């Protein structure tokens, strides 16, 4: 077909992500290539809100519907266990920035890099054995397993805390005072965004965690977060990052970017470059890739979502071969994926953050563990 | 209209629960004095919320007036949101929900309720905390919110995950160099006997299992070790009402009635029969004010239903559960939970427990 169609599910707080979606498909649409387009680029989607299960189902219904040949969206804790069994048996890939699952699930693509491996490498390399970890239920439980299951082998003081419950700000002035009754200055954050930055204002109320302290913060938007304040007390702080702004590619990308009318594009101008909005467009550079691959082997590409009528096999199972077969090189390193869809041979830029000085501190590659230069 | 059928959705393992909600339909249709009942069964997968889907809306094509059923934790979600928006009332013996949600009947009582009085009549302060990935956090939050009220230092493990037969071993080997003996169970049977199974540490500890079906708990084993163990029961044995239905459940046919002769009567198998209980009385009240009572899958046209949720929440009936009243929510209200007691010393009935009583021993 001449006309290739993408669904697209964008939720509640993904607005820049919308206008990176939006500005990936006007890239390749102009041209341009006797070579690079063979195909024209179509979407069509829907704004919804995750909590209600329903409304998640529904708009994935209305986009099957309409027959598209991949899917890009969102989901949180709530919304994924349902998306991504919907696509297991409609065999409809879905594209994703969100957190990878923890289960071997099928015809999901997981744009976002597992941090699983960089964080362990670097707690043997700074040899922590006596540590706080504070989490929330948003990105998985991977993580607060997977520490568990090495931690216990090389004997590390870990200590757990449950935050995704707490609304109370005043309780997260009380949750920090227990650990330094248990002596504690090193500090491990997993959480989002928007809620890391929270109890970093908190830190700066009680004061004086200023120096001795070390807080690692296990988010890959380390850009989008509240820095300023705690860098000026004397604080170590150990971040993770997947775009390097050296890529001339990248680089390349941004003055475009910062262009952008606000109007058509909201967000471009205002706030900086979300990660998950710069994963949002080297999900694109995926899909056309493998399709580009798909009329390169000439393959005429293969409803309703009802359980009764049994779905088609011959359908669905041909794009997924095709679409992990990839190897871009985009602004998040190199894009390679599994069997299950989630991310490799990916290079995670660690960041090291002191009251001394603010440098780029090595790479993380699954091979060479942490390089520290 | 002279008969109302209800759908019915069943996931796996549940076949003591599929004959005990036949069962109570057959005494129905039996009488002797209003309408007719009708049920339509449809067999799912819990895991796959695709299935799930797709059995629900085969119910509802049918439009059947009230879905019955069970839901896995990946499958609530579901169920919840589908109920709500397409307005059709849900009941279940399955665990509580930990949101507020609206168009569901929860059978089962609140289990979060008993252990936060329970506790601080063993004066217990240290101990540790099996939780599942089933029932919800609800429960772990109801310790973690009380756990700073009242100061109790705690060790809460997440068992859910544990497939291997092996880890059980490593987690309680560190657990006597924090030297404390007490125990605190929150998972399913299929995984809580497996503990007891994985029992030199029997004299000198106390085991809290918080599970509505202490009968096909495996603890015997234990038992003779001398470990004392907790138990929490809904069934009431000493109830007439109760051995009224044991004595013509058990002498049933195998064929139609499997699981009948084959295992003990099961809280959920109980839970199920107390389920027609609900729906014959609120349908009965909707007879009593004539309330008349009246296809698509989809939410575009959207989509009446609102009619039965009132009449389900507000009934007072005496069941095999003893008093079955509800909450604005679905949960329930003026009920009364048996606590048993096993001890090496003797096994006995300790007492029972209410929320405007909280907790008395005789």
Redesign the interface.
């Known amino acids: 077909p001449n006309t290739i169609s993408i669904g697209g599910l964008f939720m509640r707080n993904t607005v820049q992500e919308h206008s990176a979606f939006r500005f990936a498909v006007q890239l390749y649409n102009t041209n341009q290539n006797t070579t690079e387009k063979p195909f024209h680029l179509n979407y069509h989607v829907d704004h919804l809100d995750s909590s209600?299960?329903?409304?998640v189902?529904?708009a994935f219904?209305?986009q099957f519907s309409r027959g598209v040949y991949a899917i890009f969206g969102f989901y949180d804790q709530?919304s994924m266990?349902?998306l991504t069994?919907?696509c297991?048996?409609?065999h409809t890939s879905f594209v994703t920035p969100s957190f990878p699952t923890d289960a071997d699930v099928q015809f999901v693509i997981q744009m976002r890099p597992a941090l699983k491996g960089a964080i362990l490498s670097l707690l043997s390399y700074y040899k922590w054995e006596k540590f706080v970890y504070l989490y929330d239920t948003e990105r998985g439980?991977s993580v607060?397993?997977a520490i568990m299951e090495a931690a216990v082998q090389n004997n590390w003081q870990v200590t757990a805390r449950?935050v995704g419950?707490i609304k109370d700000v005043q309780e997260f002035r009380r949750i920090i005072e227990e650990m330094d009754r248990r002596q504690e200055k090193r500090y491990l954050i997993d959480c989002e965004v928007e809620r890391i930055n929270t109890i970093l204002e908190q830190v700066v109320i009680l004061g004086k965690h200023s120096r001795g302290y070390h807080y690692m913060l296990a988010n890959l938007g380390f850009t989008d977060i509240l820095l300023e304040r705690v860098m000026h007390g004397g604080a170590n702080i150990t971040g993770f990052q997947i775009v390097n702004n050296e890529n001339p590619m990248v680089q390349q990308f941004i003055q475009r970017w910062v262009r952008l009318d606000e109007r058509e594009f909201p967000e471009a101008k205002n706030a900086p470059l979300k990660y998950t909005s710069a994963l949002t467009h080297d999900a694109i550079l995926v899909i056309a890739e493998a399709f580009r691959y798909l009329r390169r082997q000439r393959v005429d590409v293969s409803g309703d979502?009802?359980?009764?009528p049994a779905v088609p096999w011959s359908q669905g199972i041909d794009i997924e071969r095709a679409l992990k077969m990839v190897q871009v090189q985009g602004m998040t390193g190199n894009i390679q994926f599994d069997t299950y869809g989630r991310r490799t041979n990916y290079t995670i830029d660690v960041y090291e953050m002191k009251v001394s000085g603010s440098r780029k501190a090595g790479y993380w590659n699954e091979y060479e563990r942490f390089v520290p230069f």
């Open positions: 209600n299960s329903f409304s189902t529904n219904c209305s709530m266990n349902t069994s919907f297991g048996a409609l439980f607060l397993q449950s419950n979502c009802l359980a009764n």
